[PDB]
Structures are given as structure tokens and as C-alpha cells.
């Protein structure tokens, strides 16, 4: 069908007025739009993309680390097995490190080589993709990060309407900017974002990228394809065969992102990308305050536990911060948060009471103000409030956190552990009790 090749939701911007017009924000965060391409965004805001050019990056921080992915240059929208015999999803890629200076030299020489060749099944040539360049340090990237404060609020790295701002600590690559340096054929394999959070991606240019997008509600079909073909959906590198998807009645959105175009990847949207030319891209996550975002983040948080994968967004910690600090006025979002908090509060009460009835002391430990969420050092599950720490780590004040189950598996009666409490019961009950739906007259 044509229903399987739907048009891309696309907003065409001319000026600042268009960029700050509230229907834009609403269009991006509408769950019916799996992706939104905001064309002409950088030009409309007079954003200086030059601050993210390879030449500028090399001058700024020439020894900055780059995670190199070495890949094969595959034809068009396809992915062939090493031998060029059949199309497959798997596309593993070896990792190494280099610096911005060294990668720049390669990106530039690759272009010169192409010019010289233009004046002259596979097997395929090898290319290198410069990935995951960490732009978190404001003292190294001051002008770069400042330029991105010119965006409308809903798309910024930091804003009051961004759940990731309410986490209250850094989640590298989500509430900090990552940069990608590309040559033609550089591929971002298929995935969903961490905990299904929206992503913002700006192409710096000078060349284009081609994007492939599948709506969130078809992710199970792709997960099933992965399980059938011995791939881990979450953790392996795969490039979907478009003929498999068409045969499975999965719609695929496909489009070109030109320099200065902003791509909004909506919550839980499955996507993959290839560079058509030589370009750089910048990206980060945003978590709009909508029922759909919160729900999908919680679903993936729980799915991650079943798949034994760490959630980079600590959804327990975040939910308590939301209750302390955000006046929520959408009834649907409100009820989801309230439901989650009650579950958390009740499981904590059940556990705390079992510990006390077993004669185990609970030690008042408290918390530092900007202290991150904790995860179990063994199984990597988020641990909230009651921290299980060995007698030795407690004495040494390293406070290495375990969850209850992992502690119990190590030390049957918890004789090797102390139990540390970061929040008083009465304080958590109050935050819950005082978290009520705020009235807003708007839709
Ligand atoms: O191509 C762009 O402009 C966007 C790149 N986006 C990426 C890029 C990226 N990587 C670079 C591409 C790549 C190439 C080859 C193998 C693996 C990977 C994954 C890491 N990883 C992720 C990622 C990872 C975990 C959760 C959410 N997102 N996203
Ligand atoms: Fe990503
Ligand atoms: Zn554990």
C-alpha cells in the first residue's frame, strides 16, 4: 500500500515568528506524528552552524575523544551480508577511539579522494564514522552550547518543560549534547531512544542525511524480526530490510534531512540514519510533560528490567522529583504519576516492615542535595531510598549500593550488610499526599 509509505510530517519555517508559534511544539509532541522534520530551522533562528563545523571543532578541542565505528559502505538503503549473497539485518561494527583532529583529517581526505575518483553484491569498501563526541563540558564548548539556547524552549537541552531537566543530574548524551562526524555511508543502526525519550537532531552540513522511521506501535514487529534472526533488539546493531517490513505491513517513513533541518524523533519511534554526504550532526533528548511520554518511558523502564539492561533514566527518582516540583495539570499524566508513586511507596513500606520484623536495623543516612539516583552494583536495577551496603563498604564510606535481592543472594540473613535510608517515611508520605491535580483551563 501507499499507507506503507506515508508522507513525512514536515513544518517549513521562514522566521522567528514561525519558530516560536505554539502549534509547532504541539505538532511535534502529538503521538500521531512519529517524527517531525522542521525544515529551515537554523536559518529561521539565525543559528550559527559554523560553530559545529569540523574546522571550528578542531580549533576548539583538537584532542577531544571520538568513538570510531568502522563500517562497510553499503548500497542505497540495503544491507548485504559480508559475502554479498543476501540481504540481512545484522550489521556489526568494530569500535576504537581517535581524536577530533585525527577524525577531521580523515573526513577531509575522504572528500578529496572522492573528487579525484570523480575525475578518473560488493565487496564493499570500509569507512569510519565518528560517533558519540561528548559536548557536556561548558568550559570547553561555551559558544557551542550557548548557540543552542536560541532554540524554542520545548526543544532546548534544558527547560522547565523537559522531564530530563527534572531528573536533577547529568545523564550523559541525554541531557547533554553529542556530536557525530560523518562521511558518506556512515550508518546509525536501528533503535529506540533510551527509555523511549524524544530526541532532537540538527544536521550541521554541508551534506545531507537520509532517515528511516517506524512508529512506536510497530516496535514489537521489529523486536520479533530480531528474535527470529538471533539478534538482540536493544543491544545488537541491525539495519532493517525494507522488503521484510513492507511484507509485514509495517509503514516506513523516509526523508532527507538537509543542513539546518531539525528532526524531532517522537517518543519510542524506531529509527535508523545514513549520511548521504559529508556532514556533522548534533543531538540530545527531551522529555515533554505528556501522558504519552511518561507512559512509554515507564514501559521501557520495566521492559529493561526483564531484558537485564540498565535504564539510563531513573524513573523512580524522576517521579518523586516531579511530585516535589511540578504542578501537573493534565489529568491523564497526573493519574499515571500518582499510580507509580503509590506502587513505589507501598513496595518500600512492605520491605521496610519486613526488615524491621526480622530485627534488622535501618540506619538514617540522608542524602546530599544534587546526589544522583542509585543503581545496584550487581544487577543495575534502580535502587530507591533503602540502600543495601556491605559492612566493609559502610566502614570505608564507599557506600557501594546493592538492591535487596542481590544483597540477600550474597548474604542470606543480611548479616554482611547494613541498610541505609535516604528519605524519611513521613516525608515521602507528605510529598505523595500533597501531589494533587492542578487546575488548568487550557487543552
Ligand atoms: O546519526 C545521527 O545523526 C544520530 C545518531 N544517534 C545515535 C548514534 C549512536 N551510536 C553511533 C552509531 C552506531 C554505529 C554503529 C554501531 C553502533 C552505533 C550506536 C552508537 N547511538 C545512539 C543511541 C544509543 C543508545 C540509545 C539511544 N541512541 N544514537
Ligand atoms: Fe539514538
Ligand atoms: Zn541487584
Author numbering: 880 to 999, 1023 to 1345
Sentences copied from the publication:
KDM6A (UTX) and KDM6B (JMJD3) are KDM6 subfamily members that catalyze demethylation of Nϵ-methylated histone 3 lysine 27 (H3K27), a mark important for transcriptional repression. Despite reports stating that UTY(KDM6C) is inactive as a KDM, we demonstrate by biochemical studies, employing MS and NMR, that UTY(KDM6C) is an active KDM. Crystallographic analyses reveal that the UTY(KDM6C) active site is highly conserved with those of KDM6B and KDM6A. UTY(KDM6C) catalyzes demethylation of H3K27 peptides in vitro, analogously to KDM6B and KDM6A, but with reduced activity, due to point substitutions involved in substrate binding.
To ascertain whether UTY(KDM6C) showed an inhibitor profile similar to those of the other KDM6 subfamily members, a set of nine known KDM inhibitors were selected, and the response of KDM6A, UTY(KDM6C), and KDM6B to them (at 10 μm) was assessed, by measuring inhibition of demethylation of an H3K27Me3 peptide. All three KDMs displayed similar inhibition profiles, and, as anticipated, given its similarity to KDM6A, inhibition of UTY(KDM6C) activity by GSK-J1 was observed. GSK-J1 was the most potent inhibitor of KDM6B, KDM6A, and UTY(KDM6C) of the nine inhibitors tested. A structure of UTY(KDM6C) with GSK-J1 reveals that GSK-J1 is bound to the 2OG binding site identically within error to that observed with KDM6B·GSK-J1 complex; the propanoic acid of GSK-J1 is positioned to hydrogen-bond with Asn1103, Lys1084, and Thr1090, and the phenyl ring of the terahydrobenzazepine, as in the KDM6B·GSK-J1 complex, is sandwiched in a hydrophobic cleft between Arg948 and Pro1091. The pyridyl-pyrimidine biaryl heterocyclic GSK-J1 ring system is positioned to make bidentate interactions with the iron, and similarly to KDM6B, it translocates the iron ∼2.4 Å away from the HXE … H triad. Such metal movement has been observed with other 2OG oxygenases with certain iron-chelating inhibitors and may, in some circumstances, reflect potent inhibition. Further, crystal structures of the JmjC and Zn(II) domains of UTY(KDM6C) demonstrate that binding to both 2OG and the inhibitor, GSK-J1, displays identical structure to KDM6A/B. UTY(KDM6C) activity is also inhibited by small molecule probes developed as KDM6B inhibitors.
